[PDB]
Design a protein around this ligand. Structure first.
Ligand SMILES: [Cu+2]
Ligand SMILES: [Cu+2]
Ligand SMILES: [Cu+2]
Lengths: 91, 103
């Protein structure tokens, strides 16, 4: 709880540096023992191809799971998001 | 095991929605009396994210409408060629307490 703000910021920070990510729409996370379980919605170009979005989800999984190692489970789903949209994550 | 009848009922409903080229994966599980499920459907590879999402919404509508003991359904789309068969892969693995609390 106290420490859940920091891991949320580390995950958003890592996710948004991935090419093809237009921001993190939603992220919920929970500790289980020492490891983090989280599910995240990333925003993506609405006109990307389904295959292109699956690559971006896949790359987001590698970069967040790779930089933060207290994560045991991360579920990433992709959603269309317009280029002008600047809504910050909600958590 | 015990999930077989509803798992096939769900695949049946999904595959009748236009634009679904078969159901790739389906996991369904009870949480109390309510069913929680997630599935991956195969869609035309040049579907845009926007076009595929409409198929997902239409798949959520047909399944959540036909079965109604479904409390949660997650649908994701993945590229699948028109000639591809490969019958759906099923899982019936239960939800941890923490997973339910995640949502
Ligand atoms: Cu893949
Ligand atoms: Cu998913
Ligand atoms: Cu939707």
């Amino acid at each position: 709880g106290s420490h859940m703000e920091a891991v949320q910021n580390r995950i958003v920070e890592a996710a948004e540096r991935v090419p093809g990510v237009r921001g993190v729409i939603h992220l919920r996370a929970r500790y289980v023992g020492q490891d983090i379980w989280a599910d995240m919605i990333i925003g993506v170009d609405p006109e990307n191809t389904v295959e292109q979005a699956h690559e971006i989800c896949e790359a987001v999984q590698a970069a967040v799971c790779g930089k933060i190692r207290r994560i045991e489970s991360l579920h990433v789903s992709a959603e269309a998001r317009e280029i002008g949209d600047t809504t910050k994550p909600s958590f």
